[PDB]
Structures are given as structure tokens and as C-alpha cells.
Amino acid sequence: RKSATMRAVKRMINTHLEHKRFALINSGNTNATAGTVQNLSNGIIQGDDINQRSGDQVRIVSHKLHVRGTAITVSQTFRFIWFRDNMNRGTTPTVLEVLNTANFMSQYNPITLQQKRFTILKDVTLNCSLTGESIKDRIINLPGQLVNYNGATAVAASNGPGAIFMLQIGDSLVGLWDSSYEAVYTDA
Amino acid sequence: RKSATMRAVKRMINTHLEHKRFALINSGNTNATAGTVQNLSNGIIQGDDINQRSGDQVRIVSHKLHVRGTAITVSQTFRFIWFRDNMNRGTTPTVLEVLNTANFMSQYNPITLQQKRFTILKDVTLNCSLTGESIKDRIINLPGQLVNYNGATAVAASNGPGAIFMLQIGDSLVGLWDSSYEAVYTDA
Amino acid sequence: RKSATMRAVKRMINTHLEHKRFALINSGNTNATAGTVQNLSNGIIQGDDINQRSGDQVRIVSHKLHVRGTAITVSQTFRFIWFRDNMNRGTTPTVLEVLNTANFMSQYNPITLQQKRFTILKDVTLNCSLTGESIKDRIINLPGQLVNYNGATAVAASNGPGAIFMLQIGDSLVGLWDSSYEAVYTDA
Amino acid sequence: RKSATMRAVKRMINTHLEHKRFALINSGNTNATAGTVQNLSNGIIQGDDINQRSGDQVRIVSHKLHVRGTAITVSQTFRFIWFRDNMNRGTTPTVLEVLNTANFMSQYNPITLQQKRFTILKDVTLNCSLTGESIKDRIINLPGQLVNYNGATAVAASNGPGAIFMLQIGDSLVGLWDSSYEAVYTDA
Amino acid sequence: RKSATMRAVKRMINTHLEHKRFALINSGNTNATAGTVQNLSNGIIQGDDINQRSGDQVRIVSHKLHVRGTAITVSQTFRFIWFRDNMNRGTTPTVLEVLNTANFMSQYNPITLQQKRFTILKDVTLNCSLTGESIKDRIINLPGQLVNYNGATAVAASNGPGAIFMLQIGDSLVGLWDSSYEAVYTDA
Amino acid sequence: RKSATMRAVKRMINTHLEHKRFALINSGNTNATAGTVQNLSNGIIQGDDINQRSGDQVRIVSHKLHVRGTAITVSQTFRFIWFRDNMNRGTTPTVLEVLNTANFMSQYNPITLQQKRFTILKDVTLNCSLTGESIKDRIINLPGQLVNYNGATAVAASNGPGAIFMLQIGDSLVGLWDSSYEAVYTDA
Amino acid sequence: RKSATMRAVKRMINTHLEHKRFALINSGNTNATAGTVQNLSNGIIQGDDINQRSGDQVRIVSHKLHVRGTAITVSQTFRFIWFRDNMNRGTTPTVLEVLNTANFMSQYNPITLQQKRFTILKDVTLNCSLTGESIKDRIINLPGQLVNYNGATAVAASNGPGAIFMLQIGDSLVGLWDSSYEAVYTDA
Amino acid sequence: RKSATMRAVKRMINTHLEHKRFALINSGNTNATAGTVQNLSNGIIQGDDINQRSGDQVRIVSHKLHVRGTAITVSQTFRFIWFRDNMNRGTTPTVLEVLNTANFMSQYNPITLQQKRFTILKDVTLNCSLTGESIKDRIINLPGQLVNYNGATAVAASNGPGAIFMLQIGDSLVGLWDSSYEAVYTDA
Amino acid sequence: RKSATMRAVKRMINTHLEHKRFALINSGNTNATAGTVQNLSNGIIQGDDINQRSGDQVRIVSHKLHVRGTAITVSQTFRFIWFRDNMNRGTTPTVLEVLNTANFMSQYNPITLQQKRFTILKDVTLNCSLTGESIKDRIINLPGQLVNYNGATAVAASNGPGAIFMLQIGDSLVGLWDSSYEAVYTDA
Amino acid sequence: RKSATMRAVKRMINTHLEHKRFALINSGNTNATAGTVQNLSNGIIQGDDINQRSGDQVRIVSHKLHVRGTAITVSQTFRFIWFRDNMNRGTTPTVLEVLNTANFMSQYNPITLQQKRFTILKDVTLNCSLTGESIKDRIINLPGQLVNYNGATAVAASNGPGAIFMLQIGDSLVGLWDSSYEAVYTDA
Ligand SMILES: [Ca+2]
Ligand SMILES: [Ca+2]
Ligand SMILES: [Ca+2]
Ligand SMILES: [Ca+2]
Ligand SMILES: [Ca+2]
Ligand SMILES: [Ca+2]
Ligand SMILES: [Ca+2]
Ligand SMILES: [Ca+2]
Ligand SMILES: [Ca+2]
Ligand SMILES: [Ca+2]
Ligand SMILES: [Ca+2]
Ligand SMILES: [Ca+2]
Ligand SMILES: [Ca+2]
Ligand SMILES: [Ca+2]
């Protein structure tokens, strides 16, 4: 009925927009017991290319995260938290903004999750064993939202509301992890 | 049921376009008896930033003029004419193109208003009194239109059909006026 | 019915997009017995101007080809094949990719036409006679399609799927031909 | 029905207005490689006669262009571009305002055609051959529109929005062309 | 309706069959006053390639003839008779089988056209004038029929019922003519 | 209903065509960090046997990939990318045509995936652990599409639009991988 | 439903009758300023062959005239008048019976056209130029009527009501013309 | 309904046509191991009698074949193949055109039967035994078709499309066979 | 109705496929008391001719057996068993696979007829009497089924599921029998 | 409705038939690189007990296969192919009849799978790892079909159409596998 008419309107809108693609790779990082936060959507900068943007908005159609862990010298845990910062004013968020404590086992920060500063996209835990599977990986594909920006370059000050991030935290410092990201997006 | 569904299609179209914003300030200008014409939409130049444009068209969603006059040494009248040039071929229009005579009390130019060279957005008259209210101001908000451009930079030759202008004219030379403008626009 | 309001949805979509225009002229070329292939849509490069593009996709709304032959020293034939390379990977197609043999009388290449590598837009034959009408010309105007690109500049490696090309081939070497091209397109 | 009732209203209106007529001839002109622009509707001046106007507006009911080409010393091309200047502010448009380059093979000016500064009524190419048909001609009849004026006399400063022009451009300087024009119009 | 559903069944049948293509060229031939008969479909021989066939039947989907004539030393006429031999038993048909007399002006053979031995596909007459247009061409595209074969190779004995031929006849001997032929066919 | 009627029409079409079958095996290959691209559909060559083809088209009904990896001397990753080359013009595609970088973690090439040069059929990642499960395999079965060919033999120049390939890439060089492939197809 | 039933009756009547064919050629005739009248249907004589007749009636199903002119020594006009004599009593009609004067420019004879002695089938005028196209031709195909006869042989006295004729008249004596005629007819 | 009144229309058509009859007897012929082909419908020649024809077409209403074998010196087989040559061009068909080999046991020629050069009316096998029934016979009565002719007399060159023939072939040379034929036909 | 719609779908499928034809003859064979088994469908080998096949499947549309027996020196019986081997794996079946004992009077093999290894097409018994009718024949025509092949050539190892055979068995050794076979088939 | 009461008819039929059960165990077999084929349904021999049969037919209601691999000295792969020979004539099938090559990675035999000689019931791959899970197993339970037999005892010559077999093939020779089988069947 009319709801199918409106979804057809959305599809024919999307046939007139270029679906731009940005890809990213991030390899050879050590497991962090205190945790690190990695930028994902920040690499889309202002310009005229296929992985660049016009203005301070894109609209992510779909976006895909691939994480991979490798246990070195001990069996260990890799935790990856794919999340969206709905309220970013030009920073990279810290670990204690996202987690209640800077421990890999921790639950989320109660205040920032109550006020919906962050939306969790996926919480992935890889347990890599030196006597079992020492290499584990996970690929997650999700539809995206609006991404606002506060600048033109690929710095932390260009992050805006809707910026996509990944937190890595684990129980060791020795093991290694890799990451890759793509985002299909429109820039109308 | 016809305009409502076409209105919803307009909502879905506009939620896919980046609404870009350009702001402008213009302070410390003397009152003009012969009148001057100021540029408003000309400062949207070609580029990739939020206040810039792609190509030679933008479509103003809404735009806002703020005028303010203050009387110096005599009581005087400030007249601000917010207008759109429908037929601009790369100039800034003169005062006698818009007004019948170059006087602050004048009615519009009959020939150019007959052929609809200009559309008057708002005609504002501020009377500033040194024995009463010496400072007056006025803020006007309007929905916009298509703006064509004839160039890439912020010169008069880049003005095209649909360009937004402001005419200031008064009855003294010594009083001061300020203006500020902002336009919300799409660049699809 | 709903098909016509879908048409009105498409028209009001196209109202919000800038219709960018690219123009090109190519004069003073000799008739070729082995044939040459000329680039048409390749001249739309990345940038912010009215004849430039963002990203790697444009959608040609309409595009117009003007070919013109002039007989020199003999009465001769000019053949112009306006075509779309549906599968281009960053080249300019050869004459034997399009035509079964490199002769002006030849039918199309059977394999590349069976696999729909090329869509023929228009095949135009001008017979210019030194005892008759020594100058002939033809203008063809057609609705367009999606054009993909593989690069940012105007080289052969930026041609992509949907690229517009023109093949000239004739029966003499000494006659002259001119061509010109324009493309109305959106770059959303 | 009601649409034909409104059509009968329009016919009853047009039976109460004098249909004025203006004729023009322009013979013995050489072919221009850079191009020239000729005035057509400029010759309706203010006055009380049958080919004159009252005020600054007329409404062209129908208007008819006749062009003719004659090859002298070489076979050549005559290009005639009948067009309406929608945005004229008291000039005769130049060639580069209409055409992208000043060549007879050129496509239109992308900027001025995007902003609809000009509406092309008819584009006519005559190829005249000293070994074939040395004389060619073409007669085009079209319904008209509102023509505004900016003055009273038959000068370029009296041209206004909706003025009718013809651009001649060719590939030689030697051959001769002729023109004639009529306009049937109401002056209510 | 019945025709619509059988048409959809026919499209689903044809999209499951390979549309094979055969191309032919035939240049540099003199005008014949007695007339000659050329083979068109005979070059589809038995084999496994895209321009070959399996068995003794193909079904031509569409096929395309291109004829071209050029006058040498006299103004002359070229006649081309595209025809299908419905009843061929392994020959190339003679001129007097098709035409009532071996003259370029002659009507068809009354007996063989009465018994429907031949079906005329197109009868094309080119008048080439050395004081006017000395080079003429004509391209004809038509849907095809079943073709049977009496052999495997490209000899006249492999021609069968449904074979495609072109008769050329003219009024001079010295002028030249060119031809080329394409056939899109299925081989199920 | 009528959709099931066209479904039964497709059933009766397919029961009148021979379902031909081609099988391939490919063992004893080393893990590649730069990645290699293997041919799958290319082994169907022109001929008259059950695993051969007529002409330059087959229609794959279903086809089946079996990959297998075994870790040697280190725990490692094997990535297999089953993909269809929609736009192949007689090559074997390179790794950087498919992947954004030549690394086993990399996302796809943004340009070639935007223009739909490739369609990914399956992306399979095997992590082989010398302290856990050092041998992994994966069998994928999928319905097929049309395959075009540019030649007759089993060379890369015979690959055409619709050709089937497998990209293998990993994080070590010394581990081994095996593959086998089946394609059920019609050749009508 | 009425006319279609009677139409099917006529078609099934015509399936039971032999469609007899008569062909004719007439070449190498000089252009006549006073005009000549040529016999077309008179060559169907009494007998038993395919181009002969039984009795004094045939019914022409369709019939085809081919005229061709060639300018010699001057550019000249060839006029061919294909016509039916509805009232022939065993003559060949003169030129002044058909035309008002024996001039090539003349209109028809007013008395014989008022009383419908003649029905004009086609009036064809060929202008052949020694500096343009010196050879022109025309083929006309028409359905026929009843032809009565007054005798058995191919003489003028055998012409009857419904006899088919061709008048040639021109403006020179030097140029040459050819003719051919064909008639499909039933003889029940 | 209308189908029966179309049948009545056909019957009243056939009431107005003379049903002409031709009769033929062929006695005293020896059995043939290589086979012979006999003419049946060829004996209807041009003329005015009851067993003759006008033009080149008759329509056989019904036709009747009587074959009769007689064994001499051995028990043997007589095979009679009554058939219609659909594509005859003025010959008598050979035995190898009909039969795959020239043996009495042979199946039909696959190529000429696939292209429908011949329609088999009746295949009749008589086994005559010198210790049993030494004389056998068979009469077959069938409705007929259109017969075209290529000449006026009773020679092989007058056979045309639709001609009726009979093939005798056996396993001995010394036995005798007789045949007789009649054809009821219309000659409208 | 819709069943006739599916029937028309089958007819329109079959008019798009070549009906290929294979013919066989087999003469001069002695009567067998132990019985022999003859190959019928095996002679359709892989190739490109009208009596050859593509791949390993054909679909027999109709096929025709002709048997004939002649008594020598004794009155005797000839039995012919036309049968389809449903389950053939590359052999010629033996007599005891079909018959319960190797005698001309025997009923079928109970096990192989229970499991439907064979389908009997026709069981023909000719009694040839030297004091009566010493020569008998019988022609059987039947619609066909799918035939699979296990090879390419005309050997017993190419016989597959659906192969057609004839078993001959009798009660004497000295009498002679003849056979021939046709198969109309599709090879899509 | 009628489908449910036909189901109830089948259930009340199966209530009156004894559901006979046969069980089988096969332990201690080595992994095979060339592969072996094991008999499953062959052990149901003729007799009167619960695991025996009457006649040559049973109908398997359900049947259950349990395979189990154990890695010895190397990590290896066990492949078990549970299949039904639809066309067995008293053999045990070879490995090359089922698989295209005698390798554990191989796809199926294309010819025998096209002619449906075998139906694959289940293809099972066990990867046993000496550093991981060294013992794997799998139980598959399926509804059965008709089984025909060719003899009374448990030899290969009693296998018939519908016989159940298992193929083991692997990549090592020293690892061990066990299997067990049961079949619930009726013997009416
Ligand atoms: Ca841009
Ligand atoms: Ca944007
Ligand atoms: Ca005060
Ligand atoms: Ca824009
Ligand atoms: Ca774009
Ligand atoms: Ca007026
Ligand atoms: Ca083949
Ligand atoms: Ca074929
Ligand atoms: Ca094919
Ligand atoms: Ca007669
Ligand atoms: Ca008559
Ligand atoms: Ca007749
Ligand atoms: Ca086949
Ligand atoms: Ca039983």
C-alpha cells in the first residue's frame, strides 16, 4: 500500500545519489589492558574523491567492521566495542567515557549510557588460546546513520555527532590485533 | 491526499540532502543618501566546505536578514530593501535599477518592477531618534529559492539569476548601520 | 495512477538536483580508414565547477552529438558510431572491439555485441560528394544513463562502466571531420 | 469541458484585442566565423501605429523567421540560432553568452543555459555547396510569449526580458545570407 | 491475454538461448548488367564457435544488410535485391530465377514468384550521379526466419530452404559496389 | 497463479535442455600474502562434450565451491573470495582490482565495487591453528548466472562478462590450501 | 463482425483462384514533348499460360509501375501518368484525350475527367539534372480493378473498359526513359 | 456456428468450380533394387480439356493411387512411397533425395525430411510370395493440395512446388508392378 | 484451458529446437536361436552434424523400427524385441538380462522386469512359412524418451540410461532378417 | 481435505505392515586416499527373520548412518558419501563412478550425476586434528525408498536398483574410521 509507495520513493531517491565508499585498514596493534579508542568514520575528509565528502554531513548506508585477534605468549581475551558517538564535539572519546572502569570485563558507563551519549553497535569478545584457536576473527555488517563533522581534515577535532568509533580492550599487552572498516555512504 | 503525499516525498528528499549554512556580518557602515547595494548570497563560493557550494546552483531553504541602525548627531531614517535579482547576469545592481529615484522615500523602479527583474523580499524603514530610540533593529526570516551563479569566487561577476541583495538608503550620511545575514541551503 | 505519481516523484527529485552541463568541441580531424575512437564523457573531471564532478558517478540526463563531414580531393564516406562502453575498466576501446573488421563498411564485433560490452547509441553515415553536397552534418540528442569513472582526471584510465565514446571511420584519409558534444547530467 | 471553457474564454479575449503585426527584412550579410547576433523584436517601438507598441509590454501570438544562405567562393556552413533572451537588461547578447565557444560547431554556453538566461527557439544549419545546392533557406513559425522592453526607441538599451534574437555563425567570411522576420502580437 | 502470455513465454524461451551472431563483408565488386547473386546466410558453417551452427537449422532472429554503390566514369544505377530462397535444394539461384529478364529494370519472375519460391525482403535502387551524389548507401534491418542447410561447409550445396541471398544488377559495368551482412540467430 | 504459471514454463524449458556439468580440482597450493586469483569457469571450453560448450554463452544453473586450508609451521589465516567478474574483457583480474589493498584483512576496492565490476559470491575466512584445528574446509553451493566468453580455449583471454573466479589471500606463505569447483549449466 | 465475415469470405474465395502474373519491360525510349501513350494491360492475351487470360475479363489484384528517367544533353523533365481507361472501346487513347494541351506542364482534359473517362492512378514528375541527379526513378504499387477486353491478341483493338495505360510527356526530345510493369490478376 | 457457415461458404465456392479429373495408368514395370521415381501430377498439362489446366496452378481436391505387385521367379518385396515434393524446381527427385540409402529397407533422408522438402503421403510395402499370395495390391484415397507448375507440357522441367511423385523400390529385379493414378482438382 | 496453455508452451518450445534425425540400416543377418541384441540409439555420436549430438543427452521425440524376416530352407519364427534400457551403465545388454531363458518362446526376465531395468517398447513375432508367406515385415512408430550417453563414440561403453536396443531371437539359424531404424530427437 | 485423508490412508496401510529392522556395524577401517565403497543395504538377505526379506524388493521407511573418524599420526580428513545407486545391476560401484577423480577433495562424476545414476544422500567431511579434536562423528537419519535386489544372499551380485552404499575417502592412510547403519523397512 502507501507504505510500499514510500519505500519505493526512498529507493528511487537512492538511485539518484552516488553511493560513496571509504575503506580502512589497521593492523599490528597490541592488546590494551587500559583500552584504546580507534577512529573509523574520521578518515572521510572533505574533497571530491570517492572516499571523500562534501560539507560536514554524510549519511552512511551500510558499514562493516572486521576485527581479528592473535594470542601471543599467553592465552588472552580481545574485546572490541563498535559504537556510535551521538554527541561528539570534536574529540576522540576516552575509555572511561564508554566503560564503567578501564577493565576488559567491565559493563558500560552508566551516566553516558543513560543519557545516550553512545549507541553500542556491537560488543565482540574474542578468546584466543595458545592451546586451542589462537587466531579468531569476526565480521559485522550493519546499516548506518547520519554522520556530522566539525572539520575538514582527518584529525580528532573533525569528529562530530554520529562519529563511528571502536574501542579495543583486553587482559594482556602482548597479543596482537588487526582491524578493517568500510562504509557505504551518500553525500547529497 | 495529493499535496500531502507529495509533501511527504519532499520531506524524504530534504532529509537526504545536507542542509548547508552560510553566515555573514557587515558592521560599521555609514548611512547613504544616494544609497548602496550590498551582496548577500554572493559569499557562497565554490568548494567543499559547509558554507561553500558545488557547481553553479544552490537552493535556499530559508534565509535570515538582520538590520540595525543607530542615529549619529541628527535623527535620521534608515531604509533597508531585502530583494532578489531574478535576472542578474554577473553584476551588482545599481540603486536606480531598483528605485525610481535615488532618494530614501522613493517608490520602486516601474520598468524593472513591471518586467519582474527584482522580487522585493522585505522593505524595512527604521527611524532613529536622538531624543527617543536612537537604536532600532529588525530581523526577518523567509523561505528561499533557487540561486544560480555565474562564477566560482566572491566577486560581482559570480552573481547569477536568483541572487540575494540588500539596498541601504537613508536621509543622512553620518549615522551608522550594521547587517548580518545567514542562508540555509541545499547543494544537491 | 500510482505510475504517474511515481513519475511526479522523479520530477520533483530532479527539481532538487543541479543539472550540470559539460561541453566539448573537436575540430579539424582527418578521415580514417582504420578508424579512431574518441572520448566524449571522459572530459568530466573531478572538481567543484559546473562541468566537473564529485566522486566517481554522474547520471547523464541528456546528451547531444554533432558530427560534420567535409570531402577533400575525393568523394568519400564518413561513419560516426556513437556508443556506450558498458564494461570499461580504464581504457579507450579499440576499433576491432567495436567493429568486426577495421573497415567503414563492417558490421559490429559479434562477441562484444553478444556480451553487451557496448550499446550502440547511433550509427551515422555521411556521404560527402565533390560534385554534389560536399558538406554534411547530423545532430543526435538522446537521454543518458549512469556513468562510472575510474579516476579523477581526463586520461583514458579514468574511463569506467557507462563511458561515452565515438568511433570515426571512413574510406579516405584526406577529408576532414568535426565533432562537438554536450552532456546534461546530475552529480548527486 | 471546463478546460475547453477556459480555452473559449481565451479565444473570446483574443477576439477583442487588435492583433498587431511587425515585419522586418535583413539582406546582404556576410557569413561570420566569430558570429553576430541580430535584433528581431527590438524594432517594435513605442507609438500608435500597427507595428508599434504602447507601454513596455507586448505579447507575441506567433512569430516567423526566414533565413537563407548562399555559398560564395567556397562551400560553407550557415548556422542560425533563433532564441529568446529571458533575462535581458538592455543589451544585445554576445556570441559567447549563447555558445560555449565562438565556433559554428559549438554547443551552447553551459552556464547561461543552466540558469535559463536563454531559451532556444530553433537551431538551423544550412550547408551550401558550390557543386550542389548553393542556395538554401528555411522558414520557421512558432507561437510566442510576453516581450518586455526597457525603453521606447529601437536601440539595444530598449531590449528587455523576453527579447527575440538571432545568432548567425558560419565557417567562412565570403558567403552571403538573408533574413526576414514577422511577429503577430497583442498590445492590450 | 493469449498473445500476451505466449509473448512472455517466448521471451523466457529466447532468454535461455544463446543469440549467436555472424558477420560478413563483401567489398570491391563491379556493377553487373547481367546481374550476380551473392550468398549471405551460407557462411554460417557447422562448428562450435559464435558464428557457426549445430546441425542443419538455425533460426534468424534479426539480420541486417548494408549496400553501397559508387559511380565510376558514368552515372549509373545499382539495384540490390535482398531475398529469401524458400525452396533451395543446394544451389545459388540464378538471376533469371528471380527476375523476368536479366535487366536492372525488370519485374520479378512471374512463375517463381507465383509459387513462392522466393520471398523478397527488400528491393533497393541506388542511382549514383557523377554530377551529383556519386556515393549512396542503404542499411536495412529486418526480423528473420528459419534457415535450413543441406551441408556443413560454405559451399553452394549447403544452401537449403530459407537461405538468404542478395541479387545485384545494374546498368553499367565499371562502377563499384560494397556490401556487408549481419545475422543474429539462435541454434537450439 | 500466473507467477507459478511462468515458473512452470521455466520448469518445462529447463527439462528440455541438457544440464551440462564441469568439474575442477586444484590442490597443493601455498598460502599467499599478496594474494592470487584463480580461474573457475574458464575451463569450460568450446567443444561437443558434457563439460564443454557451444558458442560463447552458457547459463550456470548452480555451482559449488569447496575450499580447504591446512596450517604448516605457524598458525595462519586463509581467505577465499568467490566472486563473479561482471565486466571481464579477456583477463584474469588482479588482487588490487578486488581488494583495496593486497592484505588478507582488507576491505573491497571501493571504485570497482561501486561500479559493480565484481559481485562477491562468498567471502570465506579459515583460521587454521597448529594448537587446535589445523585443517578447516568450507563448501558453498549457489545458483548461477549467465557466463560469456571471449574465446574458445582455456586461456585468460577467453574470460568474459560473468566469469567466475576465486581470490585466495592469507597471512603466511608456507601453509597449504586446496580447492575444487563444479558448475551445472545449460548451453542452449 | 459483418465486414470482417465478408472479408474472410473474400480471402477464402481468393485462396481458390490462381493469381496470375504478367510482366513487361519497355526501355530506351526518347522523351516526348508532344507525348506518347503506352499500353500496359494490353499484353495479357488469350490463352492458357500464366501471363495469358481466358475470355475477355481479368481482375487485377495488384499492379506495379516502375518509371526511370535519364537526362541527355540538357536538364529536363519527365512526366509519367499512370491511368485507367474506364471507357475504352478498342483504341489507345491520345494525349489530348488525357491532357488539356499536349504540353508537359498541362492539367488534365476537363471534359474527359468530368465524365470520368479516365481515372488517374499516379502522376509522377521526374526532374533530371545534368549538374545534379541525372537519373531518377520511381516505383508505384497499387491494387487493381476489373479489366475488360475487346479482342484476343495484343493489338489496340483488344483494349477494353478498364485498360491500363501510361502517358509519357516531357520538355525535351533527347533524354531517355525506361519502364517496367507487372500485374497480379485472377482469371476465374 | 461461424465455423460451420465458413464450411458452407467453402462448399458453395466448390459448387461453382468445375471439378476436373485426370487419369493415368502405368503397367508392366520391373521391380527396382536401386529404386525409380515416377511422375503422377506431371501429366496435367496446359490446355482446355477436362484433364488439362490453365496457368501454372491446380488445387487437387482428392487423389487416388493404386499399386499392385506380382512376384516373378522369387518371393520379393515391393515398396511404393507416395509423396509430395513441396519444393520442386523443375526436376524429378532422385531416390537418394527421399531415402537415406537406395535400399528398400531404408528410412527416409534425414536432411530433406527435416527441411520438409517432401511430405510422405503413404508408404506401402507389398510382400509377394510364390508359395503364398503372389499378387498383392493397395488403393489409397487422400485429399489433395495446391500444385504449382513450372511449364506447360509433360516434361520434368514443368514439375513445381506441390508436385506428386511415387517411388518404387524393391529387393528383386524380375518381379513386375503396375500403378494407376487419378486426381480430382479445380483449376480456377 | 491452462492445460492446453502448457501444451502450447510445449509446442512453442519445440518449434525453437532443431528436430535432429538419425537413420540406421542393418541387413543380411541370420536368425539366432540363442538370440542377439542390436544397438539402435548408439549411433548418435558426439559432433556437429544433423545425425550427431552435443553433450551426453538427447530427447527422442519419435522413433521408428522396421523389422523384416525371410525364411530359408525351413519355416521358422523371427522374434524382435524393441526395448529401452532404463539403467544402462555402458554395455550392450545380454539376452538373459531380457528373457528368462535364451529361447524364442520365453517370457521376460522376472527380476529385471520387476526392478524396471528395461521397458519393452514392442514385442513382434514373425512366422515365416516356406509354403505360405515366406517374407514378413512390421513397422512400428512410437514417441520417444530421454537418452543418456556414457561416452562420445559409437561403442557399447557410450550406451547410457535410456538407450534403445533390439533383441532378435528365433527358432532356426539359416533364415535371414533385416532391420532399419530412425530417431527424431532434440539436442537442446 | 483429500490430501490429509490420503495421508491417513497411507498411515493405516503402514499400520498393517511389519516394520522390519536391519542393523550393521563396520569398525576398525583405515582411511583411504584412493577411496573405498562400502555396502549398506546389501546385508538384508532372503529369509524369514526380522532383518531378512522376501522376494527382491523392500521399501526402506527410514535409515540411519553413523560415521566416526579418528586421527592417527597426522591430522587428516575423513569424507563419507552416503548415496543410493539408482541403476545398480549387481555390482558395488567404483570410486570413479561417483567422484570425478579419486581424491578426497573431488567433485562428483559429471556423467553419472547427470544421468542420475546416483542420488547423494549425505556428504560428510570430518577434520580430525591431533592438536585439537582428534575424534569426530556424525549421525544422519533420512527417510528411505524402494530397494530392489538381484539375488538372495549378501554378495555384490545381489545389489540392485535402489541399493544403499557409502564411500569413504580421505587424505591419509593411517587414521581409523568406524561406521554403523540401520534401516527400518517394510517387506510386503
Ligand atoms: Ca565537491
Ligand atoms: Ca555532504
Ligand atoms: Ca525621549
Ligand atoms: Ca549545486
Ligand atoms: Ca557524483
Ligand atoms: Ca503594451
Ligand atoms: Ca556443438
Ligand atoms: Ca541448430
Ligand atoms: Ca552456448
Ligand atoms: Ca483456357
Ligand atoms: Ca477471365
Ligand atoms: Ca489454374
Ligand atoms: Ca544434448
Ligand atoms: Ca519383499
Side-chain angles (χ1 to χ4, degrees), chain A residues 74-147:
Chain A
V74 280
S75 302
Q76 48 201 280
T77 294
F78 292 91
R79 185 183 182 192
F80 304 92
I81 303 172
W82 198 9
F83 70 101
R84 170 188 210 254
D85 193 349
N86 316 305
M87 297 184 185
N88 202 280
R89 300 149 83 100
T91 57
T92 297
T94 60
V95 161
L96 287 175
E97 281 178 60
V98 177
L99 293 168
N100 178 60
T101 42
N103 188 258
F104 78 103
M105 273 302 290
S106 171
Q107 306 286 337
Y108 298 136
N109 183 285
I111 304 180
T112 70
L113 262 290
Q114 182 197 70
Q115 71 203 36
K116 308 155 160 59
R117 189 187 299 191
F118 306 117
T119 298
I120 303 303
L121 306 171
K122 211 57 176 169
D123 207 316
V124 179
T125 299
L126 303 181
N127 298 316
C128 292
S129 187
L130 289 183
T131 62
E133 302 305 283
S134 48
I135 298 151
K136 301 207 160 174
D137 65 311
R138 177 78 39 86
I139 313 180
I140 312 104
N141 204 5
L142 291 171
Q145 289 183 240
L146 196 68
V147 185

Side-chain angles (χ1 to χ4, degrees), chain G residues 45-138:
Chain G
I45 62 174
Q46 271 183 8
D48 290 310
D49 221 329
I50 188 177
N51 61 340
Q52 293 175 166
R53 64 185 151 92
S54 189
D56 278 329
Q57 284 203 347
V58 300
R59 173 172 295 273
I60 292 181
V61 174
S62 66
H63 65 132
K64 183 159 61 188
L65 191 61
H66 183 183
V67 298
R68 182 192 183 247
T70 300
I72 315 285
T73 312
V74 280
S75 302
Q76 47 201 280
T77 294
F78 292 91
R79 185 182 182 192
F80 304 92
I81 303 172
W82 198 9
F83 70 101
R84 170 188 210 253
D85 193 349
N86 315 305
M87 297 184 185
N88 202 280
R89 300 149 83 100
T91 60
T92 297
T94 60
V95 161
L96 287 175
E97 284 173 59
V98 177
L99 293 168
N100 178 61
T101 41
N103 188 258
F104 78 103
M105 272 302 290
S106 170
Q107 306 286 336
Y108 298 136
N109 182 285
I111 304 180
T112 70
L113 262 290
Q114 182 197 69
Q115 71 203 35
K116 308 154 159 58
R117 189 187 299 191
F118 306 117
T119 298
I120 303 303
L121 306 171
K122 211 57 176 169
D123 207 316
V124 179
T125 299
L126 303 181
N127 298 316
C128 292
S129 187
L130 289 183
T131 62
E133 302 305 283
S134 48
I135 298 152
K136 301 206 160 175
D137 65 310
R138 177 78 39 87

Side-chain angles (χ1 to χ4, degrees), chain A residues 20 47-49 53-55 187, chain B residues 20 47-48 53-55 187, chain C residues 20 47-48 53-55 187:
Chain A
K20 286 183 185 177
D48 290 310
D49 221 329
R53 64 186 151 91
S54 188
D187 200 39
Chain B
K20 279 175 192 173
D48 291 302
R53 70 183 143 90
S54 184
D187 196 35
Chain C
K20 286 189 201 164
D48 290 313
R53 65 178 149 93
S54 199
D187 193 44

Side-chain angles (χ1 to χ4, degrees), chain E residues 45-149:
Chain E
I45 64 160
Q46 270 178 9
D48 288 317
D49 213 348
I50 194 185
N51 65 336
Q52 290 175 161
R53 60 177 147 100
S54 200
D56 275 317
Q57 285 202 342
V58 294
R59 180 169 288 278
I60 296 192
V61 173
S62 63
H63 63 129
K64 170 156 58 177
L65 195 55
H66 185 178
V67 295
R68 177 189 190 256
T70 175
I72 310 293
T73 68
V74 276
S75 295
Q76 52 199 276
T77 292
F78 297 84
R79 188 174 180 203
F80 306 92
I81 307 196
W82 201 9
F83 71 102
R84 177 205 207 247
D85 193 350
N86 301 310
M87 316 205 164
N88 202 269
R89 303 150 83 97
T91 55
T92 301
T94 63
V95 162
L96 293 167
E97 282 169 59
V98 171
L99 297 174
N100 183 60
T101 42
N103 186 258
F104 79 108
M105 278 297 296
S106 169
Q107 308 280 336
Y108 303 137
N109 187 296
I111 298 170
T112 76
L113 264 290
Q114 183 196 70
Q115 63 203 41
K116 305 166 161 75
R117 191 189 294 188
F118 305 120
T119 291
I120 303 299
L121 302 173
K122 209 60 175 170
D123 208 334
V124 176
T125 302
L126 302 190
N127 305 315
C128 280
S129 195
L130 278 181
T131 63
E133 324 303 317
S134 64
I135 298 170
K136 301 205 161 173
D137 63 316
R138 177 81 44 84
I139 316 187
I140 312 103
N141 196 359
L142 288 173
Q145 272 181 265
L146 173 57
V147 180
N148 297 279
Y149 288 91

